[PDB]
Amino acid sequence: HFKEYQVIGRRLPTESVPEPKLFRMRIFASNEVIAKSRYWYFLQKLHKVKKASGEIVSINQINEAHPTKVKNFGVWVRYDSRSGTHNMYKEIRDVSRVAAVETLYQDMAARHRARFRSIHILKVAEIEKTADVKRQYVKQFLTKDLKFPLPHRVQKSTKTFSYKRPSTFY
């Protein structure tokens, strides 16, 4: 289960430079250690700050404001694969940011074969109104009075032998 963390670093302030830029970003990780490692990697890559002169001011966990509210999430993702790195944008209809990022990671590992090692979450934002969604598969669930069945349900059997010839009707 993923979790959202906030990490800030200001590169061990020295003489003549008190309170540096104080780089701030949000990191999604399953634990504090992984969040700190990802923050260090992002600082090394995007910025010129390394752990040699770095410092973790504070790490905090951010909880989604409305864990029971359905939202459409627009995520900008930059990931690396066998080919060169390129930007990517996707839209996810989920309830919480953590679930949306988890689904994005699962899709990337499934379709693009990209795993957590080479995936960067640039930004996660909520789409407020309809007709701003640019993906058809997300617009699919926005239709008014959406009703559909669940044909051919895969019923589970607790016994090897069943004297019923079960039907998959729903």
Partner: protein, 174 residues
């Protein structure tokens, strides 16, 4: 992935459609036509007793192809039942006259002693032209195709030799 895609079929007052498991039956002035679609995996609904919907849920392009072709097949069946279909073929020969006797037998085609026979699956009626009419489009069309395909001019120039029977006109009986 499409959550639900549906196609509509009209039901004229002169015909009645009874729908059960995928087997489909049509009744009209010209007779009754029935077909089996248990391998197409589509569902039907009675929305207003005058229109028939065929829909597929959670089906992709592969399933959408069958979803759409179901409407075409049902429309073809309805048109055949209401009005029927007519097919015609032309007799062309250079030197050897072609004699056809109704099973349909072709004799004296390009001076060939062998008599080519095409079983009848559809009716035969009559200029030097044949007329084929039947409620089922598939039956009459296949009969015409078989009639055209038996007159193969083997080991001969295609352009120079024109003898044979070919499909010429298509339309409804009405």
């Amino acid at each position: 992935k499409y959550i639900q895609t549906e196609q509509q079929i009209e039901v004229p007052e002169g015909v009645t459609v009874s729908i059960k498991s995928r087997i489909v039956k049509v009744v009209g002035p010209r007779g009754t036509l029935t077909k089996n679609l248990k391998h197409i995996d589509v569902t039907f609904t009675k929305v207003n007793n005058q229109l028939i919907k065929v829909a597929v849920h959670n089906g992709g392009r592969k399933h959408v192809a069958a979803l759409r072709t179901v409407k075409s097949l049902v429309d073809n069946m309805i048109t055949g039942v209401t009005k029927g279909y007519k097919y015609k073929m032309r007799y062309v020969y250079a030197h050897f006259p072609i004699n056809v006797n109704i099973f349909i037998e072709v004799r004296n085609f390009l001076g060939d002693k062998k008599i080519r026979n095409v079983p009848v699956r559809v009716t035969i009626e009559f200029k030097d032209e044949i007329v084929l009419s039947g409620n089922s489009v598939e039956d009459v069309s296949q009969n015409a195709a078989d009639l055209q395909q038996i007159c193969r001019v083997r080991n001969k120039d295609i352009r120079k030799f024109l003898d044979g029977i070919y499909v010429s006109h298509k339309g409804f009986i009405t």
